[PDB]
Amino acid sequence: QIFDSSCKGVYDRAIFNELEHVCNDCYNLYRTSHVASGCRVNCFENHVFDDCVYELLLHNPEEVLLMRDAIRG
Length: 73
Hints:
It is a single chain. The chain has 73 residues and is mainly alpha-helical. The protein is built from 3 helices and no strands. The chain has one domain. Helix 1 crosses helix 2. The longest helix is centred in the first third of the chain and has 16 residues. The relative contact order is 0.23. Keywords: Amidation, Disulfide bond, Hormone, Neuropeptide, Pyrrolidone carboxylic acid, Secreted, Signal.
């Protein structure tokens, strides 16, 4: 494997308003680092989808979230 960022300004653009807010929201859960490193970068699947969607929005319905990763990630 190799490090990377599954979130990209592109879907992050749509995500910015849709998901990114969720991250801005999840920010309350954690203190720091995990929110920033999981808000809009390498965040998409690993963090912002594990933490924000997997527990807040869609604990399972990451389906169309996986597609978004096509652009975001």
